[PDB]
Amino acid sequence: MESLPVIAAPSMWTRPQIKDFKEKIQQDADSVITVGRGEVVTVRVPTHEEGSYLFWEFATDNYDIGFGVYFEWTKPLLDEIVPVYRRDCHEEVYAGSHQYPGRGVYLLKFDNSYSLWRSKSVYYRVYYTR
Amino acid sequence: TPAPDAINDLLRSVDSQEVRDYCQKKGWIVIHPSNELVVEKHI
């Protein structure tokens, strides 16, 4: 019978070496995003055919930023995986992971909506397991 | 090749660039090239 996938809780943690993370990430331009004032940026990460999990890392230079994760089922249904909340990722590297509920696309949302006066620089990286 | 949930427990507990690189070498984790990801902007 059809059933609705049970969606695993995501994991979130931090690690201290932010300077080294950004230096590593800086080595590729496409891994550095500018989020203007009042702007929200969405990074789409499709589930890989051979993948079990998505792992993410992110950090910012001088200010906090909103971070949330959503899963888009391939109008289309959208599930809230990590509720959007401001993180101090200028202080530490924020990392997390989530198990694939099925086939689809993750949306990593970097939400600057609340900032009237500040652009943000976002350094990020994503991997998958099998 | 360990289970995905094992990789997860390791990275959650001991995370470092060194541990990441090791996991990457073993092919336990595979990097998504960032140039292949669709990035959207909205106000």
Author numbering:
A (entry chain A): 363 to 436, 473 to 528
B (entry chain B): 16 to 58
Pull verbatim passages from the article behind this deposition.
ACBD3 is a Golgi resident protein involved in the maintenance of the Golgi structure and regulation of intracellular trafficking between the endoplasmic reticulum and the Golgi. However, in enterovirus-infected cells, the ACBD3 GOLD domain interacts preferentially with viral non-structural 3A proteins, which causes re-localization of ACBD3 to the sites of virus replication. In this study, we present a structural, biochemical, and biological characterization of the complexes composed of human ACBD3 and the 3A proteins of four representative enteroviruses. The crystal structures revealed the details of the ACBD3-3A interaction, the 3A-3A interaction causing the assembly of the ACBD3-3A heterotetramers, the interaction between the ACBD3-3A complex and the lipid bilayer, and the roles of these interactions in facilitation of enterovirus replication.
Of the six GOLD: enterovirus 3A complexes, only GOLD: 3A/EVD68 and GOLD: 3A/RVB14 formed crystals that diffracted to a resolution suitable for subsequent structure determination (i.e. 2.3 Å and 2.9 Å, respectively). For this analysis, we chose the GOLD: EVD68 3A complex because we resolved its structure at the highest resolution. In the GOLD: EVD68 3A crystal structure, we could trace the polypeptide chain of the 3A protein from T163A to I583A. It contains four secondary elements: two alpha helices P193A-V293A (α13A) and Q323A-K413A (α23A), and two beta strands I443A-I463A (β13A) and V533A-I583A (β23A). All these segments contribute to the GOLD: 3A interaction mediated through multiple hydrophobic interactions and hydrogen bonds. The helices α13A and α23A bind to a mild cavity of the GOLD domain that is formed by four antiparallel beta strands of ACBD3. The strand β13A interacts with the strand K518ACBD3-R528ACBD3 of the ACBD3 GOLD domain, while the strand β23A binds to the strand V402ACBD3-P408ACBD3, both in the antiparallel orientation. The dimerization interface of the GOLD: 3A/EVD68 complex consists of the hydrophobic core formed by the residues L25, V29, V34, and Y37, and an additional intermolecular salt bridge between the residues D24 and K41. Analysis of the crystal structures of the GOLD: 3A complexes revealed that the 3A proteins formed either one of the crystal-packing contacts (as in the case of EVD68 and PV1) or contacts with the second 3A molecule when two GOLD: 3A complexes per asymmetric unit were present (as in the case of EVA71 and RVB14). The dissociation constants of the GOLD: enterovirus 3A complexes ranged approximately from 1 μM (EVD68 and RVB14) to 15 μM (EVA71).
